[PDB]
Design a protein around this nucleic acid. Structure first.
Lengths: 93, 90
DNA sequence: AACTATTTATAAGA
DNA sequence: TCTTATAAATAGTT
């Protein structure tokens, strides 16, 4: 963008809202591209800072959530901590 | 990337898994960033081509899913077809 | 398992 | 909303 920003909470409410709208779309777009390219079924659930709900599902949210409940095998599970750990360990590329 | 690619299913089993691994991480990194910048809680559930599960949540998947089931109000709900439509305008 | 040039995303502007 | 300069992700090659 016009300037480099640090990843930390945006304190200006107006800025936070504009950024949320733009970046939410960008995330759904990336989910869309991954689902099509790699034949993935994806659900994304977002609650904003006011706990308003925003959702996306490649095809069918109920289908994915149900598959999730039925899953009975160990699987990759990531949190923000894990992402940050990947970034600490990973090269600059 | 070195070249623009069409958004269509990759049939190269190998290219598919390579692309899957990198873009999965890219999506989760963008989720992380949105969660911090805008003070949001985010969950991602992915079943790959083999129906294997991969999940992310900013803090706690259990919490997000519980709150989702409780949610009563109308809210935005998008699918692939909606995104494709938005992209027609560009 | 890495690098790099390019496409794509987006921060600040309009 | 958009546009547009600039940052970030990633396709292809290694």
């Amino acid at each position: 963008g016009r300037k480099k920003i640090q990843i930390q909470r945006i304190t200006d409410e107006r800025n936070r809202q504009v950024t949320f709208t733009k970046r939410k779309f960008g995330l759904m777009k990336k989910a869309y591209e991954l689902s099509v390219l790699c034949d993935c079924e994806i659900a994304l659930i977002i609650f904003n800072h006011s706990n308003k709900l925003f959702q996306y599902a490649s095809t069918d949210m109920d289908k994915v959530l149900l598959k999730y409940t039925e899953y009975n095998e160990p699987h990759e599970s990531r949190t923000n901590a894990d992402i940050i750990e990947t970034l600490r360990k990973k090269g600059f590329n």
